[PDB]
Design a protein around this nucleic acid. Structure first.
Lengths: 716, 249, 735
RNA sequence: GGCCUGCU
RNA sequence: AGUAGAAACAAGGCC
């Protein structure tokens, strides 16, 4: 039958009908009479629509061939011959522009004169039944319907026929051409009734070929095919198989509970080796401040001018000389770098306006100090294979180092009060609710407690230094840059003040990965002689740069004044995390506020004021040789803030591992102290897990010592 | 006019012609998401790192013909170098602030009508009345509650057809909404937003947010009302209760 | 006196101050170089935990595979992957018996979803291993490349737009003699059957960074695109199953997890009378993923899908069949340094099979020597067990089956147990009349776990009396206690954009106040610090200050120009009006009534060249990877302002041979923008159909010109011009 | 010496 | 040298 559509109809219509065939997903080889019927429907749609044009009037202009002009409007514009999505697109667009009603089924054409749709259907059966059939299929329709049938008859409601009658003679001539051409073909044994509305399909997902063999190799050891295994599974029913293997399984497979008593836990062993060194990016306990007493705010001002003005406030400069060498570098380079920094600072002082940011010369001194041109050149393996020295990067456990007493004192003095306010908080919306007033009062109390704390000063120092370093690295990637360490505080009298700890020289910072390292050299003034705790300054070079006179009742001290100079490095991640050190304030004060709220849930009243003023209640916050010492809530605030600050400063994988594996043991010990009969399956394994995190970090070793002390004081 | 004209210009060049011809409508989404740009793992680190560069943000090419290349002192506002995989050009953040001090101005009177949820929140809070804070242990029990206080009793898909018919009346397809509540919602949000020119996509998104009901599991103590859950952070705490009555009531 | 914070625990219980034990204020550990060492170590460890299995050689991939299932029962407490098929089938049968109708229903909904799912659902995924280029690429890019290759090779069933048809094409590709791929350096290369099989069965290995809570780094894996559809269907089934199990806690959030934990502890302890003792085990499973054999997941799913259409069973079984034969790419490689000659070199991992061992240290030398026998075409066969939690939900199902197997109806003894399982972590409440009963119950639970290939970490687990325990960093002590140290890293600028960052910060403060019991004063301090960091990050200072920045001039002139300066946004150098009462309001709407109409109009102008919206999914959704958890998405309330710009892209593609991808990106985006202008609903609802672009665009041009004349700007001249231009593009597409 | 890139 | 820690950075590539 398909030979007929090969022969007669034009290409355009046959591929339109083929795409309509693909539309609903049925195959053309099984039933083709539908293809012919609907392609004839589509053909009558065209032949009825084309050759029919309109101009600004009604009364369509009919031309056998559209002449070249702007007057190519089509009388009837076709609906079908398009995908369902576009057919409904045209339906909705016509409804929204023509203000007509939206039909629920697919029309075939639209006309302007009568401003409505045409649903053309030419069926094998006579018209006077198919018409009202499709009419009762369509609900309350104003779209006019018109149908032909092979006998040659026409019909329509309203007795309406919308265009010329010679066109309809055309239609029925086409119709009988179709008819008495099948006459030569002979199809009416099924042509009248060949489609009955079949819609059914079964989804087929068959495993075959290579993928089947893979299925045959992904079974238990004693199975040969997926078919057999699935049959076995379907036939499988529970018949007490877990019990049999449990009985047969060796009894050494057990989870015996070892009781956890007061005498069970042993102190954590600390590693032994050379004392632990300093790792901070700046001096914390041995910092010195040169000040100007200016009225500018933290960010307000220009760095270089402030630094120069602060440094001019000090008199007593001496020619620098080596006091304590780096022990691994070239100290003369550090000396020359310091003198170069001074010289270029003067050079800025001379000229017209202090630059906002200064670049330094790339001398051999800072070329060595900043580690320039030291990365091995990257080459290909095929060119370097016979080199005996060629091997992997050194990948082994870090060097072992024992704890020293300097970190303990540094933390002790990091929780001490100061003679300045190191936090100038921002603005918030004016409090409107009583709860907001309570929150503001609490916040004011904590700010009064923590602002005068060395932890806040360290927070500001780190934030400013890391912000400046990151910005300089991102801006001046190539050229070495000078950045004075600046921090602005407020005195007890209320006068604002600036403080200059020293200088940082940032080097080449072409940082691609988050782990890539930018090297800088840090110089900081101090008065602490490095000849008393040399092991804490393994990586520092310390010079003697001047003498300071601070008013004291013992005449006047006239102390020496040294310069701690070192080469340090950071990374994008480290800079970003060090510039978010202000969340240590959060951590600490959230803990304290949780304490206050928990206690106030007992007594139905806010308990902040008496906690902060009466200072009756105290918490164990340290141990003295006499015994455990307790301090007021403010001291707890400062201690927790210092702990968070040191966590942010000495952060490392060792800290995370020890924190987790020691929190586990802390929970076990707490369960013991709560009389909850705690038990363990392998306590030695937990101890070994904790002890492997303690390698060389001073902070984690101090935490381990604190944990041992807590165990000793606990378990009683 | 224009649209078909850049269509013809695209089809003029062979590669885009092939892309238009062989690519089917269904694959639309795939090729639209086809990109070499990986999704950032650490957005904060790079936002703090990129903002230290010059020309850290991106803007459409049209910026080159509305904002001058430099400001009064000569600080550059935009660059003509296009982004990696787009025709947009990289520009400095000042071009933002500049646009807020001398850029073109319009009538933003209809934004309150579009962003109905947020302005309703503001109105509800502005007329609220606070009360005394009572300090006592709160037994916070976890419950499933509806957070959206303006949901019109419609699901995501249920209101999606409404949203299309309100914004994209022609792409609705087969669906013609039966429920009369949807009829009235369509009528109201059609006559209300008849000429709003913010964007079809944002209008649809905000209509989805407003009409679609959404639910989440939260620790609550008292309240349980939609209007009382948006301020759950302000009325309920660990050891304190703050009596509150939104402006709606 | 020496200060010691830990001594604070002598007065404050450990859980009431547990936040102090979370050093989440410093930089988390990161990996620096290759992850090849970790990948090799994981492969060797997975293979040696199942050493007593039986060896075979796959006839298709030619790789050695180790099957330990039904192997000898363990005789020691060391980890073992010798799961027994009959035991696990019986466990699943008991799970079904205790929950009748679970499998049949879940299979019904899964069948519905599978037969109505679309291909585009695969684009909604993070990095995936594209085999066309042998590298990780965004899910959409890899899917597009694979579809292009399939269409070039003759597999065009995916044009039906159905994920099931895409999987049919994927499987049909397995039986092809020779496929063709494209490489740029374009060159067409031919892949034989075995090479393509291994490329489709392989995984890409990387090192996990930003992982807090352990000293050593780990390795993670990413699969290809051929196997992700089957994984999606299997995980859909597993999620539908677990949603019907109250003992599971994987498909829920955190608060739901806490609620279920409280309910189970109350149920276990309350029902226990005075005579019965109760004990809670806070258990962690050692080597959870390395001991889960994909064959056992195949067994579980084929038991689940019994009495179901065979096509459903086949499509759900394809995934574990491929995992059982999965291969793993070793990794980036190894970098060597020579200090004598002062140079460095980078050898790819694919050379580990043949490269001499003189360059490697003792540990790496032994690892390579042990893993070499499993090396096939630069990748190692990893049949014995899963690599990194790809089947999280099925593992949770197995754990829930173990938990339910002690409902006192199967124990047949006075003791019994229950609890909650979330993959790699569990809490087990066991009750028994005497300590001997508790010991016997825990021993039998451990033994049954060892029969299913699941091991309990004795070093990271402990048992106490009920009332105090831990679960996924949630510490329960007669009621869950807030931590607030897990969410600390999320208190900074997110890094999306100005408005997005502001809204996300305020919303995070609000949420942590609601959930994590953040205090009022602490919340105010957090708001202040966040505002400070936000202003210092975006160079948007108050405007009344003299802080010179790259943006302080325009901000200052805008400040001096504005009359009501209280309405200026913090992004434009205005005061901050936020407070505890205003944390749930966007900044634009909070300052709407205070803004000057000129500034208000300039700010919220639709014609701004900065705002760009792509799809309904990416309107106000921000992907923030939370600390100590999987990547998560958040809805943030924000108004589309001129500050909603999107930041610059990487731009490093210009120096790589893969430079043509940018031109393809630009052309695809131009075509997509044209289509959207032709089809406005393209973004909100993704278009569907089987026609091509130009057909729809030209036909809609026809119709829209027509109707927009029937009322609108068009004119006959223009309408006819459009009609004949449509004809012109038609004949152009003809040729 | 000149120019390109900074998660590809 | 320095940062850092089971492998890396201490710029890369292209002419």
């Amino acid at each position: 039958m398909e030979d007929f559509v090969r022969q007669c109809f034009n290409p355009m219509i046959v591929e339109l009908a083929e795409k309509a065939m693909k539309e609903y997903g049925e195959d053309l080889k099984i039933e083709t009479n539908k293809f012919a019927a609907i392609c004839t429907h589509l053909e009558v749609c065209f032949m009825y629509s084309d050759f029919h044009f309109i101009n600004e009037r009604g009364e369509s202009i009919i031309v056998e061939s559209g002449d070249p002009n702007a007057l190519l409007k089509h009388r009837f514009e076709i609906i079908e011959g398009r995908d369902r999505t576009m057919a409904w697109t045209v339906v909705n667009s016509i409804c929204n522009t023509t203000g007509a009603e939206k039909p629920k089924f697919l029309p075939d054409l639209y006309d302007y004169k009568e401003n409505r749709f045409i649903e053309i259907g030419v069926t094998r059966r006579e018209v006077h039944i198919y018409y009202l059939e499709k009419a009762n299929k369509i609900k309350s329709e104003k779209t006019h319907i018109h149908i032909f049938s092979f006998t040659g008859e026409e019909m329509a409601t309203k007795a309406d026929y919308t265009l010329d009658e010679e066109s309809r003679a055309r239609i029925k001539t086409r119709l009988f051409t179709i008819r008495q051409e099948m006459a030569s073909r002979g199809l009416w044994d099924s042509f009248r009734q060949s489609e009955r509305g079949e819609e059914t399909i079964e989804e087929r997902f068959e495993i075959t070929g290579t993928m089947r063999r893979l299925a045959d190799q992904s079974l238990p050891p004693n199975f040969s095919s997926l078919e057999n295994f699935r049959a076995y599974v379907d036939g499988f029913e529970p018949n007490g198989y877990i019990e049999g293997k449990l009985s047969q399984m060796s009894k050494e497979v057990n989870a015996r509970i070892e009781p956890f008593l007061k005498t069970t836990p042993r102190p954590l062993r600390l590693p032994d080796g050379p004392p632990c060194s300093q790792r901070s990016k700046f001096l914390l306990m041995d910092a010195l401040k040169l000040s100007i007493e200016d009225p500018s705010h933290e960010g307000e001002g220009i760095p270089l001018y402030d630094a120069i003005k602060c440094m001019r406030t000090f008199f007593g400069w001496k020619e620098p000389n080596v006091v304590k060498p780096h022990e691994k570098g070239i100290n003369p380079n550090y000396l020359l770098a310091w003198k170069q920094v001074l010289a270029e600072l003067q050079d800025i002082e001379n000229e017209e306006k202090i630059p906002k940011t200064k670049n330094m010369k790339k001398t051999s001194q800072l070329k060595w100090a900043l580690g320039e041109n030291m990365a091995p050149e990257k080459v290909d393996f095929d060119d370097c294979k016979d080199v005996s020295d060629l091997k992997q990067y050194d990948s082994d456990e870090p060097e072992l180092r024992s704890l020293a007493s300097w970190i303990q004192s540094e933390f002790n003095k990091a929780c001490e009060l100061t003679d300045s306010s190191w936090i100038e908080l921002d603005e918030i919306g004016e409090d409107v609710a009583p709860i907001e007033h309570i929150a503001s009062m609490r916040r004011n109390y904590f700010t009064a407690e923590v602002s005068h704390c060395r932890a806040t000063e360290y927070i500001m120092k780190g934030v400013y230094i890391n912000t400046a370093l990151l910005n300089a690295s991102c801006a001046a990637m190539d050229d070495f840059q000078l950045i004075p360490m600046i921090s602005k505080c407020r005195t007890k009298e209320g006068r604002r003040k600036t403080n200059l700890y020293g200088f940082i020289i940032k080097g080449r910072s072409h940082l691609r990965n988050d782990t890539d390292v930018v090297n800088f050299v840090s110089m900081e003034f101090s008065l602490t002689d490095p000849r008393l705790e040399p092991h804490k300054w393994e990586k520092y070079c310390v010079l003697e740069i001047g003498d300071m006179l601070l008013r004291s009742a013992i005449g006047q001290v006239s102390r020496p004044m040294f310069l701690y100079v070192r080469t340090n490095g950071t990374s994008k991640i480290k800079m970003k995390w060090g510039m978010e050190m202000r969340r240590c304030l959060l951590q600490s004060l959230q803990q304290i506020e949780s304490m206050i709220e928990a206690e106030s849930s007992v007594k139905e009243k806010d308990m902040t004021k008496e906690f902060f003023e009466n200072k009756s209640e105290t918490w164990p916050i340290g141990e003295s040789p006499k015994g455990v010492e307790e301090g007021s809530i403010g001291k707890v605030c400062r201690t927790l803030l210092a702990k968070s600050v040191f966590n942010s400063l000495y952060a490392s994988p060792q800290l995370e591992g020890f924190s987790a594996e020691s929190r586990k043991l802390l929970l076990i010990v707490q369960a013991l102290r709560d009389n909850l009969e705690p038990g363990t399956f392998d306590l030695g394994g937990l101890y070994e897990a904790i002890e492997e995190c303690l390698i060389n970090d001073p902070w984690v070793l101090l935490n381990a010592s604190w944990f041992n002390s807590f165990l000793t004081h606990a378990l009683r | 006019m224009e649209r078909i004209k850049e269509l013809r210009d695209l089809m003029s060049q062979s590669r885009t012609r092939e892309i238009l011809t062989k690519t089917t409508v269904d694959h639309m989404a795939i090729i639209k998401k086809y990109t070499s740009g990986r999704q950032e793992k650490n957005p904060a680190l790079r936002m703090k790192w990129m903002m230290a560069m010059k020309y850290p943000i991106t803007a459409d090419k049209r910026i080159m013909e509305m904002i001058p290349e430099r400001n009064e002192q000569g600080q550059t506002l935009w660059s003509k170098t296009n982004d990696a995989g787009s025709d947009r050009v990289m520009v400095s953040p000042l071009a933002v602030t500049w646009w807020n001090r001398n850029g073109p101005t319009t009538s933003a009177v209809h934004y309150p009508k579009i962003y109905k949820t947020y302005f309703e929140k503001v109105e509800r809070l502005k007329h609220g009345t606070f009360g005394p804070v009572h300090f006592r242990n709160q037994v916070k029990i976890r419950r499933r509650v509806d957070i959206n206080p303006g949901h019109a009793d419609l699901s995501a898909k249920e209101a999606q057809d409404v949203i299309m018919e309100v914004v994209f009346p022609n792409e609705v397809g087969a669906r013609i909404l039966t429920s009369e509540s949807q009829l009235t919602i369509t009528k109201e949000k059609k006559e209300e937003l008849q000429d709003c020119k913010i964007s079809p996509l944002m209008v649809a998104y905000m209509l989805e947010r407003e009409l679609v009901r959404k639910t989440r599991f939260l620790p609550v103590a008292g309240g349980t009302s939609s209007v009382y859950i948006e301020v759950l952070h302000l009325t309920q705490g660990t050891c304190w209760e703050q009596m509150y009555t939104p402006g709606g009531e | 006196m020496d200060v010691n914070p830990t001594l604070l625990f002598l007065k404050v219980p450990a859980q009431n101050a547990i936040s102090t034990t979370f050093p989440y204020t410093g930089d988390p550990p990161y990996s620096h170089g290759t992850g090849t060492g970790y990948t090799m170590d994981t492969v060797n460890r997975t293979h040696q935990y199942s050493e007593k299995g039986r060896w075979t050689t796959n006839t298709e991939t030619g790789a050695p595979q180790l099957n330990p299932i039904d192997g000898p029962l363990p005789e020691d407490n060391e980890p073992s992957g010798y799961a027994q098929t009959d035991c696990v089938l019986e466990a699943m049968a008991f799970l079904e018996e205790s929950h009748p109708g679970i499998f049949e229903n879940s299979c019904l909904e899964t069948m519905e979803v599978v037969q109505q799912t679309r291909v585009d659902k695969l684009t909604q995924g993070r990095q995936t291993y594209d085999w066309t280029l042998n590298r990780n690429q965004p899910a959409a890019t890899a899917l597009a490349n694979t579809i292009e290759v399939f269409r070039s090779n003759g597999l065009t069933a995916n044009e039906s737009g159905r994920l099931i048809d895409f999987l049919k094409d994927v499987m049909e590709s397995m039986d092809k003699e020779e496929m063709e791929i494209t490489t740029h350096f374009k060159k067409k290369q031919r892949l034989n059957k075995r090479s393509y099989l291994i490329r489709a069965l392989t995984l890409n290995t990387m090192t996990k960074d930003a992982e807090r809570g352990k000293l050593k780094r780990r390795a993670i894996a990413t699969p290809g695109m051929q196997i992700r559809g089957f994984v999606y269907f299997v995980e859909t089934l597993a999620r539908s199953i677990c949603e019907k199990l109250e003992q599971s806690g994987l498909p829920v959030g955190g608060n739901e997890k806490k609620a279920k934990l409280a309910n189970v502890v109350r149920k276990m302890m309350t029902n226990s009378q005075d005579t019965e003792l109760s004990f809670t085990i806070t258990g962690d499973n050692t080597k959870w993923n390395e001991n889960q054999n994909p064959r056992m997941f195949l067994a579980m799913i084929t038991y689940i899908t019994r009495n179901q259409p065979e096509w459903f069973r086949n499509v759900l079984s394809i995934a574990p069949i491929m995992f059982s034969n999965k291969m793993a790419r070793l990794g980036k490689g190894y970098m060597f340094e020579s200090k004598s000659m002062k140079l460095r070199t980078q050898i790819p991992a694919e050379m580990l099979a043949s490269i001499d061992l003189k360059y490697f240290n003792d540990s790496t030398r032994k690892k390579i020597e042990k893993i070499r026998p499993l090396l096939i075409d630069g990748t190692a066969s990893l049949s014995p067990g899963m690599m990194m939690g790809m089947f999280n939900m099925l593992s949770t199902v197995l754990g829930v089956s173990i938990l339910n197997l002690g409902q006192k109806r199967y124990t047949k003894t006075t003791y019994w147990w229950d609890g909650l399982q979330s993959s790699d972590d569990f809490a087990l409440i066991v009750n028994a009349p005497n300590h001997e009963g508790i010991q016997a119950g825990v021993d039998r639970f451990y033994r049954t776990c060892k029969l299913l290939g699941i091991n309990m970490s004795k070093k990271k687990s402990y048992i106490n009396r009920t009332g105090t325990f831990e679960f996924t960093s949630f510490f329960y002590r007669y009621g869950f206690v807030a931590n607030f140290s897990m969410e600390l890293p999320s208190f900074g600028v997110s890094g999306i954009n100005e408005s997005a960052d502001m809204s996300i910060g305020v919303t995070v403060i609000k949420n942590n106040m609601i959930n994590n019991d953040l205090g009022p004063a602490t919340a105010q301090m957090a708001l202040q610090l966040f505002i400070k960091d936000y202003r210092y990050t975006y160079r948007c200072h108050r405007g009344d200050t003299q802080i010179q920045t790259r943006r302080s001039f325009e901000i200052k002139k805008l400040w001096e120009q504005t009359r009501s300066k209280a309405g200026l946004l913090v992004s434009d150098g205005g005061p901050n009006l936020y407070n505890i009462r205003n944390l749930h309001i966007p900044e634009v709407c909070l300052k709407w009534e205070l803004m000057d109409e000129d500034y208000q109009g300039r700010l919220c102008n639709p014609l701004n060249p900065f705002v760009s919206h792509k799809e309904i999914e990416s309107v106000n959704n921000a992907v923030m990877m939370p600390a100590h958890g999987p990547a998560k998405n958040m809805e943030y309330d924000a108004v589309a302002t001129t500050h909603s710009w999107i930041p610059k892209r990487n731009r490093s593609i210009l120096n790589t041979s893969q430079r043509g991808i940018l031109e393809d990106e630009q052309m695809y985006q131009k075509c997509c923008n044209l289509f959207e202008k032709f089809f406005p609903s393209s973004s909100y609802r993704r278009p569907v159909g089987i026609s091509s672009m130009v057909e729809a665009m030209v036909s809609r041009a026809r119709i829209d010109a027509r109707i927009d004349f029937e009322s609108g700007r068009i004119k006959k001249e223009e309408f006819a011009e459009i009609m004949k231009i449509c004809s012109t593009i038609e004949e152009l597409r003809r040729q």
